[PDB]
Design a protein around this ligand. Structure first.
Ligand SMILES: [Zn+2]
Lengths: 70, 150, 75, 246, 186
């Protein structure tokens, strides 16, 4: 449910505390190393926006490269 | 799942939910219109230019802000339902009225639910809300097999 | 602008109405050899019309008794 | 004095009452209003005298406000002498003038009667069983010009709020105004205050009003009776009730 | 297939459809149900205020796409099928705008300056609604649209005969439009 909430916050096409939450999610994904979590996040994004949005986020110069596994 | 037969009340409720949620306001809108009538009843000329002016005269802070809140509720509900009122509602309404959104600069007459002029809008909303409530109540009666109508 | 027509319809609904007999018409016609007096009488009739339209009353009640006793419309 | 205003009011009472229409469709109201007004418009007891005085005062106020919207309000006599229709309708010049003043006063008297006699108020002045506090508060409110704000108007509908029956009267004078006034003071205290302090602030604001000080002068058993009457009137103004046991 | 002809008129020959009725419209239910009565002078009455005892439009009448939160169908069709029909209509209208903008500016009510963008936004809102309804991913939704278009391409050789098509290629009236809607939904 936390990852879903982050996926929604990211799917939007601008508040500080939401960014605090996304940062905490980023730290949790990096710390725990159960990459399954990021797979779910990627999957959720595809459900909402589509595969091309995610492919775009994988490209260089992007702020959300942490969403992806290694 | 063939809900119309198997579940008519749920079916109708789901169909009209978007608008039925707005039925909750009608106590407030009715109170507003009733107080406006009380103030303006027996008055012949109405010299108020807009809502902003009317509020500015009722500038006492408590009263100003209560009236403002109530008018905001009315304007929101109108803005949402207006395109439905343009076709359904049993009260005919020129397209110009429903065409654009309303704001505090709108004419004041829109709030007075007289049977002529822009006040038909105040009447129409009150009527169309009532319809929704009544209509779903009918469905329950049609499945109650009883005559508890009070 | 007074819509006397509505008052008349209300009264007719509430009470009966009948035309003036020729005798009464000639009598009032003879008595009212003055515009002022006509206006006075007509004002009493207008007040009575209003009250009757609202409340009503006995179609056979004499108008003078009604105005003087009930409406206390002396003076 | 210049003119016998008491007689002119008494002459215009029937026409004014005749202008009044009620929502509840209580047919027999206007006749009783006529009787009540002809009884009250006297200088027999101090209550009638004060009622008449306050009526005359409020009429003068309305007339002054209307006059301040017209040019040369002193030239009214002249204007009447310029109206052949009025002259021939009246016959004499004195009568023309008398009718002019009657025509001016009738609408305003009708409006004021619509305000004072909203539900059954006037019975309280006349019913001899009416307690003293009721008559005192009735005349206090009627005399006040900022509490009983009566706006000018240039068919009159008597805004009955209760569904009371015939010849019945609100248990408290001007219960509708008192309720509206207390609700206004509530709104003001609420926005001026936080959820706490609003009770004490609202009670203080009220106590400082003229009406609050007046009711504060009522001591002992009268005050209890007052509160009881207001409770009943309050319910009838708020809630529709089917029976007296309820 | 003749069923396609209205949409084709929108796409390639919009000028003809100027006064045509489009599925992208609601109707006046009051005229169709044939309470408030009305006086001869035009004011309602449940006499009062005097003492004396069609609203349906042509063309595209849906306004700003932002308002399109939910889909409602009064003609008994399932919201999903009406949504898909409306989406096909918007695609045809976009094609027509590509052919001639002025035609769509005439057909759109209230008028607009950018038909293409307006129709794009409506289409996007349609897709959002479809997603909410069926509950599939965005790509699966677009797939549903392609599947329907494919069905329509296939259902001509089997539907070019034995048909009961009570509609005109220009949807000159309200009933013609309703009938076309029902056949499409079928
Ligand atoms: Zn009417």
């Amino acid at each position: 449910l936390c990852l879903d909430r982050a996926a929604d916050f990211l799917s939007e096409p601008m508040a500080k505390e939401k960014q605090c939450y996304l940062q905490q999610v980023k730290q949790f994904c990096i710390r725990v190393e159960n990459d399954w979590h990021r797979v779910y996040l990627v999957r959720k994004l595809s459900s909402q926006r589509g595969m091309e949005f995610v492919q775009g986020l994988s490209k260089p110069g992007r702020p959300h490269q942490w969403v992806f596994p290694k | 799942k063939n809900g119309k037969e198997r579940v008519p009340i749920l079916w109708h409720f789901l169909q009209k939910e978007a608008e039925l949620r707005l039925v909750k306001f009608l106590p407030e809108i009715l109170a507003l219109q009733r107080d406006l009538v009380k103030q303006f009843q027996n008055v012949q000329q109405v010299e108020y230019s807009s809502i902003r002016g009317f509020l500015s005269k009722h500038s006492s802070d408590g009263l100003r802000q209560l009236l403002h809140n109530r008018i905001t509720v009315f304007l929101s509900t109108w803005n949402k339902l207006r395109r439905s009122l343009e076709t359904n509602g049993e009260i005919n309404l020129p397209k110009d009225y429903c065409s654009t959104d309303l704001d505090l600069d709108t004419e004041f007459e829109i709030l007075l639910p007289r049977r002529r002029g822009l006040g038909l809008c105040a009447t129409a909303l009150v009527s169309y809300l009532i319809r929704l409530h009544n209509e779903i109540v009918y469905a329950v009666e049609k499945l109650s097999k009883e005559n508890n109508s009070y | 602008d007074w819509n006397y027509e509505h008052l008349f319809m209300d009264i007719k609904n509430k009470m009966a109405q009948d035309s003036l007999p020729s005798s009464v018409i000639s009598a009032i016609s003879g008595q009212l050899q003055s515009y002022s007096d006509a206006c006075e009488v007509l004002s009493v009739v207008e007040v009575t019309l209003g009250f009757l339209s609202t409340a009503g009353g006995d179609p056979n009640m004499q108008l003078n008794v009604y105005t003087q006793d009930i409406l206390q419309m002396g003076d | 004095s210049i003119l016998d205003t008491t007689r002119l009011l008494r002459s215009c009472v029937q026409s004014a009452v005749g202008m009044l229409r009620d929502q509840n469709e209580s047919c027999t109201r206007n006749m009783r209003r006529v009787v009540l007004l002809l009884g009250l418009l006297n200088e027999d007891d101090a209550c009638h005298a004060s009622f008449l005085r306050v009526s005359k005062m409020r009429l003068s106020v309305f007339l002054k406000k209307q006059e301040e919207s017209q040019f040369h309000p002193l030239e009214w006599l002249a204007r009447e002498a310029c109206n052949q229709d009025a002259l021939q309708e009246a016959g004499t010049f004195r009568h023309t003038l008398w009718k002019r003043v009657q025509g001016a006063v009738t609408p305003l008297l009708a409006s004021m009667i619509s305000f004072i006699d909203r539900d059954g108020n006037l019975e309280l002045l006349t019913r001899p069983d009416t307690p003293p506090w009721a008559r005192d508060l009735w005349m206090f409110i009627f005399s006040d010009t900022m509490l009983l704000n009566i706006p000018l108007v240039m068919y009159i509908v008597v805004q009955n709020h209760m569904n009371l029956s015939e010849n019945a009267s609100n248990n408290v004078p001007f219960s509708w105004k008192i309720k509206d006034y207390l609700e206004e003071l509530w709104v003001q205290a609420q926005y001026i205050t936080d959820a706490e302090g609003l009770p004490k602030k609202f009670v203080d604001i009220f106590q400082q009003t003229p009406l609050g000080r007046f009711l504060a002068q009522l001591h002992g058993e009268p005050q209890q009776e007052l509160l009881q009457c207001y409770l009943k009137d309050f319910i009838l103004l708020t809630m529709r009730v089917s029976t007296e046991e309820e | 297939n003749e069923l396609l002809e209205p949409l084709k008129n929108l796409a390639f020959s919009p000028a003809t459809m100027a006064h045509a009725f489009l599925p992208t419209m609601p109707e006046d239910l009051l005229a169709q149900a044939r309470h408030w009565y009305t006086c001869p002078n035009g004011h309602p009455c449940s006499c009062i205020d005097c003492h004396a005892p069609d609203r349906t439009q042509t063309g595209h009448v849906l306004g700003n796409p932002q308002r399109r939160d939910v889909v409602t169908c009064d003609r008994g069709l399932p919201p999903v099928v009406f949504l898909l029909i409306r989406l096909l209509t918007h695609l045809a209208l976009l094609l027509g705008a590509s052919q001639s903008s002025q035609a769509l500016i005439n057909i759109i009510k209230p008028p607009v300056r950018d038909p293409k963008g307006f129709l794009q936004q409506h289409i996007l809102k349609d897709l959002e609604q479809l997603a909410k309804m069926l509950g599939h991913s965005a790509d699966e939704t677009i797939g549903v649209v392609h599947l329907v278009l494919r069905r329509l391409l296939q259902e001509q050789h089997q539907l070019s005969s034995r048909r009961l098509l009570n509609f005109d290629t220009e949807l000159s009236t309200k009933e013609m439009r309703n009938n076309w809607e029902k056949e499409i939904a079928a």
